[PDB]
């Protein structure tokens, strides 16, 4: 009987959580926009910030030649553009380079919050979250230069992340955690990581 | 470059916005937390059950068998943000009478204050080894031969030494602040989810 009540109260919490996120989005959207314009003026800001971010959340998924592509990353943006603020849109923008084709210099991936999937899950949302789905983002690599190719001897690539959908039965992955890390840690804290790299 | 100067300016805007956001969070959730607490107090052993169900590596690992005996009598846990700076956190443990705590130590309230200067020596340690909080020792009176926090040789490690932590020592090698933040930002807001999970696994 008290479990009933507890259940109802928890629904308001969930409701309040989404409202808070909505306010966050409205509040920080102009700031991120302002910050974006300055950061674009700072050469190699993003590859530096990525490298300085916690190893076990990011760099561990990044190979030397992955880093070579990422050295040409001139912009990183994260948006919460939809009615559900839990949807996250991540944008990578590269300058022309030896690895990517010009048609693939602007890479956008959308992660949608999936109520059905989130309810279905039993795992701790901070440990192994199971809530997001996405569509494949195609990348065309220049000849000889495809880092995501599935052949023997080829280093595992950061860039396979872009093909992730979250639609399989797979509680054993890191792609959703990476998305959340980029959205909720790397992007907001990017200047702090960059600043740390600079001190030595 | 001039660019790095602008970045510093913007960062300050972010920190202000982040504090403003938190104040909104406090006004929005405080009434919900009060209502929830009322209902939790009539669910027997809610808190020790939610604690046991919390991630092992965040809480359980610091709790000894004897610690768990004390925690079995935890009837209320509250977290507040009562100061002008919403980053200050006040954590309240309320126990029923038991064989460990003198009756004058059944209401244990620990205040963590956000330290501006401490935070900016450790700016990139945001979620891995935060170093931003300071606190006052919380005195606990234990019944005779029941002081789990004794520093006698051979004495098993105890969760309850957490209450004496201050964060004013030169010590970047700690778990006490991370425990504070886990309690304030994970255990307390997600307690029901933790309790529910424990109940589906019986
Ligand atoms: Ca997998
Ligand atoms: Ca995978
Ligand atoms: Ca994982
Ligand atoms: Ca220490
Ligand atoms: Ca630690």
Numbering used by the authors:
A (entry chain B): 20 to 219
B (entry chain A): 19 to 220
Publication passage describing the model:
Two histone chaperones, Vacuolar Protein Sorting 75 (Vps75) and the Anti-Silencing Function 1 protein (Asf1), are involved in the Rtt109-dependent histone H3K9, H3K27, and H3K56 acetylation. In this study, we solved both dimeric and tetrameric structures of Vps75 from a pathogenic fungus, P. carinii (PcVps75), and identified a structural basis for the inability of PcVps75 to interact with PcRtt109. Therefore, we propose that Vps75 regulates the HAT activity of Rtt109 by affecting the interactions between histones and specific histone chaperones rather than by forming a complex with Rtt109.
The PcVps75 tetramer consists of two identical PcVps75 dimers, dimer I: A/B (orange and yellow) and dimer II: C/D (green and dark green). Four quasi-equivalent protomers of PcVps75 are arranged in a solid, walnut-like structure. Two parallel α-helices (αA1/αB1, αC1/αD1) are present on each side of the PcVps75 tetrameric core, which is composed of four domain IIs. In the PcVps75 tetramer, residues E192, D193, E194, and E196 were involved in a calcium-binding cluster that had essential roles in sustaining the PcVps75 tetramer by burying histone-binding surfaces within the structure. The PcVps75 tetramer conceals the major histone-binding surface of PcVps75, which may be a way of preventing non-specific interactions. When tetrameric PcVps75 encounters histones, it can dissociate into two PcVps75 dimers, thereby exposing the histone-binding surfaces to the histone cargo.
